[PDB]
Amino acid sequence: LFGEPDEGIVISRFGMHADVESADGDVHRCNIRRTIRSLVTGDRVVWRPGKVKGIVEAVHERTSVLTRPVK
Amino acid sequence: SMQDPIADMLTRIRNGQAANKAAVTMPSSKLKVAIANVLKEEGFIEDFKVEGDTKPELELTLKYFQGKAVVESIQRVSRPGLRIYKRKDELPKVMAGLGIAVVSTSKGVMTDRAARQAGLGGEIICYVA
Amino acid sequence: KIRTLQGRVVSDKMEKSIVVAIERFVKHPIYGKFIKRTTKLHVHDENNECGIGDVVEIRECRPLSKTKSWTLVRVVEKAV
Amino acid sequence: ARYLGPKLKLSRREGTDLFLKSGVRAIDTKCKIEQAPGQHGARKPRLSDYGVQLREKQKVRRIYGVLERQFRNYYKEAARLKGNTGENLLALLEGRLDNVVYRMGFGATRAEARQLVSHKAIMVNGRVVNIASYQVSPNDVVSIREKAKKQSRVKAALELAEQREKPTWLEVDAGKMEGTFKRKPERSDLSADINEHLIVELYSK
Amino acid sequence: ATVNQLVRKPRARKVAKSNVPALEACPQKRGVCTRVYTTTPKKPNSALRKVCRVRLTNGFEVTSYIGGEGHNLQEHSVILIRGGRVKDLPGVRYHTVRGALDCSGVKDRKQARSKYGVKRPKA
Amino acid sequence: MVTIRLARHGAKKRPFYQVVVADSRNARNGRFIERVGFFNPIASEKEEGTRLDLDRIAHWVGQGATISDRVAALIKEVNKAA
Amino acid sequence: ELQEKLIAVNRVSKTVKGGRIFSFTALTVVGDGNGRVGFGYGKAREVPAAIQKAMEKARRNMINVALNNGTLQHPVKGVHTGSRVFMQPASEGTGIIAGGAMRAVLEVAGVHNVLAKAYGSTNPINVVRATIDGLENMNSPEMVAAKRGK
RNA sequence: UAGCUAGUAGGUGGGGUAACGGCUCACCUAGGCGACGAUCCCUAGCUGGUCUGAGAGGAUGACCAGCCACACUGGAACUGAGACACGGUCCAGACUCCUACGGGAGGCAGCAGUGGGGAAUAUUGCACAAUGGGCGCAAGCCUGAUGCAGCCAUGCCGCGU
RNA sequence: ACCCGCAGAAGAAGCACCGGCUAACUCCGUGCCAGCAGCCGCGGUAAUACGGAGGGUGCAAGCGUUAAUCGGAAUUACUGGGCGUAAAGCGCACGCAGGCGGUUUGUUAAGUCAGAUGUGAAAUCCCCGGGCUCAACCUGGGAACUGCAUCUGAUACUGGC
Prior knowledge:
part of a larger assembly; 7 chains; C: 80 residues; mainly beta; 3-stranded antiparallel β-sheet; two-stranded antiparallel ribbon; 0% helix; globular; D: 205 residues; mainly alpha; Ribosomal Protein S4 Delta 41, Chain A, domain 1; Structural Genomics Hypothetical 15.5 Kd Protein In mrcA-pckA Intergenic Region, Chain A; 8 helices; 37% helix; RNA-binding; ribosomal protein (chain C); rRNA-binding (chain C); ribonucleoprotein (chain C); Ribosomal_uS17 (chain C); Ribosomal_uS17_bact/chlr (chain C)
């Protein structure tokens, strides 16, 4: 999966997915690609739809200010 | 046994020959002797000699086939749940292609070889190679 | 071929309608041992001349009644 | 079918006689044999006995050039038999007209052999051919039938016929436009790859 | 095991090749994709595989794979379900085949045509 | 109502008709009473021939059963009966 | 025969001082007769080294095979553990689908008139070993009333 | 599905079919019935034989022969022995049509063909030439029975290629 | 049906596999992707396998797929499978059913042991001939008659007695 790169902030961790609220504000339950891993809710992401399901293939988790084990 | 005498017979043999009890003795029932006879006359035992049928003794002498145990095969198959002897030699054979497995005919218990082979049926009463 | 069979009636107070056992074996065969396959026909009884352990021969017949289609014929013996 | 196929190259992969690039240069030469005909796909033989045996029988199938459809047919007939299934099959196989179109020396290649029969252009004393799928008789004067009569193929063939798969059994002739299949092919004269407990063994569930 | 016991309740020869239930029949079905969905495979095969739920008319709304590289249109594309599940996919039951008619054709494949690649014209 | 008719048998063109008793009732074949010969009209070695077994036929007929003209074939076949 | 087939060398693992090592140990069959097939269990560290140690071993004890028609005297059955095995006297002239566990040992015996089949297990370790145990047993006869007159 | 019976059975008698027989009523008797598995439910039409499997067995039931069951909704008799007849009997009806609209009227589990269903599988076919069966006094006629041929790798064997 | 002419094969290979196993594998895109991928798994792997290219295998007018069966599976064991612990002693009894009990002759002859004969239809199956263009396609002949069905001898066996 691929789609169209778009920005979003990860509104929610959808368990299995992550649900991304887009730059627009549009929430898309998205997949999260095997390729990306630095994702968290709050990340600004490049998520893409499919060609909802999205896919996430870029993230943006900014610097540490809190963790658990350390993440 | 407690409920199949031929199968004790057979087993006693089994355990007998096993422990190369080249003689195994147990009561006759008329079949028992009769069978024993055939074995007797079929090298398996060379003889039996008997005393009693409502009282005990029927002593079979198992040879050595050839230094090795006479029988080197023997076991029950005629439990009160089982017979497969149909008339007109609608009883054929299993491992009695090597030994006997004395049948009981019109009258009697015989070497099976005789009634069996002979189409005379014979009831295939017990089992040896 | 024969169906006058020396069965046996045994049924009684079975008012005029007793049954004759034209009995049989059936082997449970593939997976062994001998069971009965069994036939009773309310035979000629007809006021119960098919009786108690009256090992009754019956001769196959017309329905003379609801089951009297094995007429009896004999009684041969009594059995326990 | 012939089954359709290209001849010298072939001779390189199966590596044995099967009677098929008949002309004036055949196998290898001017382009050897056994130095490929591939250059990618044969690059790691993933054999098994299935392989070995496959090839083993495959040869034999090819030796007669028969379609498998038919080959099968032979196998079975033999198999019914009280005998050791194998042998009796070979007689049968061999027994057909195509087999017998090359062994008299009309045909040479199955394709050619057949080509003749096939095109109503080799005969037998055997259930109207037009087909070498036909199967020749003891006394079958497998005889030439038109547009091949001691023509190129046949004339030359009658030579190598003699030396074909020694038909002691079918009297290899084709010069007299005849070829009197005297009797059936037997393992008096072999031309086999398998063994009768390699192929017999091979067939198995 | 006394015969007498056995006889009472007998013991079953047939086969015994079982794993889990599978369904329907009719050599094909008349069906079109519910929707054409997309799922993961397994992790080290680290891919994504393209699929479709599919209403039929010879039983069961199946989810179906749409294979090789690529898949059919969304929704109910005209899709051909020519059966399937995967070794590497538990419990799918009829699949939506391309390189085979109704569907789209298995794209970016031409390394098979009775199956995959093209649904070249059944001569 | 007994009939002895020729059931057209053998794969067509070559019928390998086979004279048979059946209830004349079936338009063509259907119910079978018992077989009674053949008439194969094409190219065969034996165990495969053409049979007319005139004798049995006659028993049936006696008590009323009927016969074909391709049984008349069979009948008058060498003028076997004719 | 005089044939030997090397049934198999076998990669086993010890699981040593350091790593997890793997060997060749060989069961091979040898036979130099219908009446003689011997199979040996070799040890060693190579396919040959193993085979050899098998062959050697195998050659150690070269023993009975399909007496009577190149076929058994009598059909024989084999267990070794839980192994269900079977072999018949027949002919090879009646055919013989010459299995592995029934034209390996049979082949190094030379004979093939004996048709067989094993139920249950895929383990040659026990099963062809059981096949062997299943083949052996076909006795010494002693008349046209052998057992019937010792 | 572990429960049965009053038409119940039997007896008994009428009654009935051709007729057997509760078989049935009349009466009575109490009979009269199932855990060797009944009762109950479904499902399956069912066989020669199909399928497969070494077979065991298992499977199978074809794409036949043999037999049936069954052939517009429910009901309902016939001729005829037989048929309450896939295109022989009455209504409702269902059902749909007829219909001056009431009344009525109207129907390929024969076929193609039609609808169309479903994965999808058959010509509005040819043919009596023979084949059969019928009718027809019969002659003949009839015969989508039938022959031949139509339509589909679906299923077989080949040459070819 | 059959029969045969012509030229040239004209008009006749695709299809499936090929990462093993399994008949067949590379080269490249991809490539931890997109994917393949029966089964194991192949997917960074510069592919083998993906994806393609190419090459190889394996087939014939076919060659693959689906739906889809008994088989192997001894995997439910009849043949032929399983309770010390791998899915196998009731908590434990009793215990009716069930089943099963010694022993001896005698005896039924029923079962059995001996027989009879009929009866399996047909297909003509198989077997084994046979028939046609091989073959497919047609038939026959021994073989489906078993068991039913029934008789009976022997009677030890077995049960009857």
